[PDB]
Design a protein around this ligand. Sequence first.
Ligand code: CUO
Ligand code: CUO
Ligand code: CUO
Lengths: 416, 417, 624
Amino acid sequence: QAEVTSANRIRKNIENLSLGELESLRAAFLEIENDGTYESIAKFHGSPGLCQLNGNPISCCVHGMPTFPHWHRLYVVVVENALLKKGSSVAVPYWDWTKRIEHLPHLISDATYYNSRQHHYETNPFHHGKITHENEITTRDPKDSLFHSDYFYEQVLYALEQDNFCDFEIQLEILHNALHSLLGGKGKYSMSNLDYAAFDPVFFLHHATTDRIWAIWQDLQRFRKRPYREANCAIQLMHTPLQPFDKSDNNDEATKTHATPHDGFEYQNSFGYAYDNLELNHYSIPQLDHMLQERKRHDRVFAGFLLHNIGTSADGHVFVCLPTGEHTKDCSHEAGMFSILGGQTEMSFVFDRLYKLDITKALKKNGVHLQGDFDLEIEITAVNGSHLDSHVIHSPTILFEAGTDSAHTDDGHTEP
Amino acid sequence: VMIRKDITQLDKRQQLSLVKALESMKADHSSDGFQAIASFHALPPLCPSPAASKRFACCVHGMATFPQWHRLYTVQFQDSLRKHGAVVGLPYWDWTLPRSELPELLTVSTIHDPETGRDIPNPFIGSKIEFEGENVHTKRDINRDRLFQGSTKTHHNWFIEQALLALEQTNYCDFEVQFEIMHNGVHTWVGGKEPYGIGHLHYASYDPLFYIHHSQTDRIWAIWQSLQRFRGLSGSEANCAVNLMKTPLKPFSFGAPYNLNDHTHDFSKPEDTFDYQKFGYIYDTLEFAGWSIRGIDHIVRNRQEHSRVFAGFLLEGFGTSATVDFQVCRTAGDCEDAGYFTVLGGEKEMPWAFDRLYKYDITETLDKMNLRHDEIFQIEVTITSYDGTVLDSGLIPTPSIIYDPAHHDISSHHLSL
Amino acid sequence: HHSNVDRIFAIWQRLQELRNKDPKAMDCAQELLHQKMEPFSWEDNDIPLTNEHSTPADLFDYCELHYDYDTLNLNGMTPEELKTYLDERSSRARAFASFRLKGFGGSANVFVYVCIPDDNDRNDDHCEKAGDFFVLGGPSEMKWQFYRPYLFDLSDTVHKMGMKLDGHYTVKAELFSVNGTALPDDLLPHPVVVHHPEKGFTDPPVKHHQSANLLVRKNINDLTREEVLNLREAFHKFQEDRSVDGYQATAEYHGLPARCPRPDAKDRYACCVHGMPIFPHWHRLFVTQVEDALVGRGATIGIPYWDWTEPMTHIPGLAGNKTYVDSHGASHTNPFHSSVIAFEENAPHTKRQIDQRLFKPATFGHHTDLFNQILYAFEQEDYCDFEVQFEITHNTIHAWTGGSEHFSMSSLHYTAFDPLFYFHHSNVDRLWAVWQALQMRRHKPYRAHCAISLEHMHLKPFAFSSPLNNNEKTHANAMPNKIYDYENVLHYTYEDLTFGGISLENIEKMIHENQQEDRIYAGFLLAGIRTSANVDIFIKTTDSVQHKAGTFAVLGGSKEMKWGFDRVFKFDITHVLKDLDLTADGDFEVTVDITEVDGTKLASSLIPHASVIREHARVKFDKV
Ligand code: CUO
Ligand code: CUO
Ligand code: CUO
């Protein structure tokens, strides 16, 4: 589907950027920070809550909704347009998180930018920003600089596998949150917080990649020959206008037209921004498709989580404990973990469907079969580190998924 | 091979046995006895323990395990009747067909079996709720006789439409949600307004109709298994809800003194439950409204061929049983009765919520409406209790509207036109 | 049934006779014994015999009842046989579990299981049943709770399990009602396992050897100006230290803010252990932490101890002096004098009100109230018995010093802030050490018989590695068991281990002397419920003449975790009663006045009626 590729602008990986390209970016962001748009643009994501200009405020970003990728997609273009106004030569770059990174990107990391052409010493606008309303500086605390793993890939890959958009979104959103918690860490004002996260400049880069992945899914969809720009799920939501994009606060005309999420699908020509390459982990789209199939080959067992994400962001860890010790491994304690981004401001949201995580590898390792009786233990911790009552949260279910070839029964007789 | 047949088919002798057996069962002082058996399903609640402060009702309702639990429940009664000298397996009342007259076996108050020549009340007609003080006959107010108001074509019935859809799903879980809801309708229809009846979770096990209904429902479940075999999926094997299947179901798991029955006890794991043969009982026929199993599979594919629109309901879990009616209203404000479904429940009920959506086919209504998927229309729902009191909206989530275009019409012209 | 039990009871009397103890005599429960037993005493009943018999004292003589038992034997064992058999039992050391019995509600059955805390995997389910006991009780029964714990012999099960006494396990108990209603286990306290202590030349596994004495703790009075000067400077520097090792942070450990459960816990509770046998261990560790700080401060000497026991004319002045003009340098405030509460942002009333003049005249030199109380504690052979008495005496200083001021020593939360806190605890720690030394004279080692389970648990926040504790040493001896040998692990010493100038040997002989003297005690069950309070008790006669029996105080705060003494606290009634010339048996009302630190009156309902126990005289024992 042609709709995905752009003619007008190119979005490239941050590493790819030439010194010249970065230089425009450094300047543009710095100027945007100076300009009115930067602070106000940040507001759209979270605090201050713009959604109800008057009346009780709520965070604007749609989260926990299928509308979610559309909203953020619009958000990135908003900043991109701002950058262009700034005089940015290129589109916002994307920090491919999935790719394991030896170190954090130089562009973001640099505290100061020499910018030799004009002798000046300034902080890197990419490095951080300040939160005007709540007087503070954004902070980052990657607890885990560790991230070098298939884990991102698995999560995203799993998301890629789903044909259904809505099924896709739930998985997609979850992987999305990982960057936020991982970068923000403990820091109250950071990526880790729903309200604060918009402030950090990394936000733009991260969303750019997430948006790119969404685009990737889109192109894959056409490979499947499913309609690229068609969602037959959450129809009601799609038509809804996406604030604040709808309002006059948003100068950007394109976004306003774009407010309905339905229109959002075709980034190409709508947005007029393209990606240098649409591949995941250097896998061609047809390559991904083949890769997906292989995964399908084995039977899989998953744990499903009903996310009624409420409250501040929190991390959850879970593993399936087995009733016996002896020969059999004790609680592995590492089924996998997922995080949820949230804040008090956020509007309540509940996932329509379960969030599936693939337990299979761990279960096999422990040597349990699907049939084997096992319990799932979950621990939910706030970013704060306060324990959250698990009792309220519904227990996760265990699903077994197989391909067309299913097993025949021992007891009973299927064929007549 | 104990055989379960249509209640109508049953012989006078067959009937004779059931009437006597149940009546004797009623008398049975034993824990195996009827009054005791009834308590399994609902009040008095046995679940946490027979003697526990807080007790919950034994309903693995709203769960995948649900058909298995009820399947064991029926056999528990069946085995009991056999102890009584029941000649055959519990018969099934096929609601699917429209029925002008309610089944005579259950309906008649008095039974004058010719052999004895004596007249006694039909134990099948009702029972008394001993523990509940109400020493009343388990009352059924089938206020809605309307059940017999089937369609004119007569094949297509609400039950049939609902059931057929359930049959369509390959996934056991998906199948069960549709399957279970269809199950609920009979409970409400018979129980009606009456406080002690089929309508209430607590009381329903007391009425004898319960067994007949579940027998039919179990029959349809068996039908699904046979279809799955045709599909090639193993009938016994369940892919879904593996965790629940392993767990044993009480009170069946609680053997004596509460559960004399050995078979159910061993069988308490639902995994074991699928092969009904393990409980040696069979059904005279496995078919749905005259369609062969092969015919059913072929027909279902055809159903897909046309576009369909559905509304999905997430069932959060109600309080007491209630029935819901929903209608689609146009922007203009016209509104048409979309359709209805009901949920059985009581206070005692353990909490439960469905993992997935419950689809209902809106298509016919919308088509008349000449409304498209795109069209902006609102769906309004009203929930009413058994009493008829209106229940508030607000807690209730809105339904989604899904569009099912014809997808994979798997075909070649091999069917006769 | 009762005939048999009565028979068994008689048997016990018979065995006592074998003991050559007066079977009839019942020293304990004097209060109840005199009480007549209704309805028999009510005399609604026809039989006058019972009416006279109503006093339980009369009850012992079965013969008065004039009913006999054909034989008094238990399970075919002669009474001689029983006595000999029991002797053998005492031969072996055993492990027991102590259970408090609330004994409330209808009859209930309880089960206890010792499970092995180990559980690597798969929703572990492995455990064994220790044993059980039953209780009888109707819905309308007088509330009763066992004063004493009920021991059970775990040793059999432990061995059976294969778990040696030395093994890490936990125990849990379940209660089932006759009705079958489950009863909340949470209310019930955790039972403690006790192992038979071995008391001989070296109880702990470490080798205490003749100490070098690098850090010494001296009393404040001995401290010279130079010594005080370094201390003043060190404290000043210390309070300045913003670091976690810093003073403010150290203060938090004791009380508010309550870090203890975790820095992030739903229920934050005061970390300090009070009302527990663990209590001296935690405090001892606490003092070291400050002390380790002082050395960093550069303090020449360890924390000094303010021997409260000695009578004091007035405040030491080191603490008291508001401003310290060393004059060597420039005048400043005395860091000893006060501290500030950063979180509350209030100021501690370091200049606490000393409502009570501690300065007390002695019967003879050393004899003092605190001495008496403290000495009493020392007398007890049992660590746990000692702790109760010891802790209470400890409490008095806080109440006296703090006085009415909310922010002060008087408050559990606040107390840490006051610098006196360190001084007092140093002394208290000294007494604890003295007790151990005395035990040593007794040839009672460090090995503790009581609170085995408690000792194993590590004491936070000292345990917290990741949360704020700079000091590794404290972390090392988180466990209270390690705590006992202060010298080896802590490597701190005291200039002298004497109490009142009494040599350790001298004190031991001294204790014997008190033993010879007749003494009736009033026992108070102290489940210290709320904010700190002071309690004064006086005995009222029929004459309604009342004399003040004496006083004791308890420290507490809302934050404090709930605690209750297993055993009663004893005070010596004897002198007053003698003066009254009232007999122990005589009917005298006991009135208790509980005054809150606030000074608001507190209802007597808080305290249950104290029992009176009379201790008859024994012969003078051993002397060096
Ligand atoms: O989600 Cu709103 O931030 Cu990535
Ligand atoms: O299901 Cu529980 O009753 Cu028909
Ligand atoms: O005991 Cu904790 O305080 Cu002196």
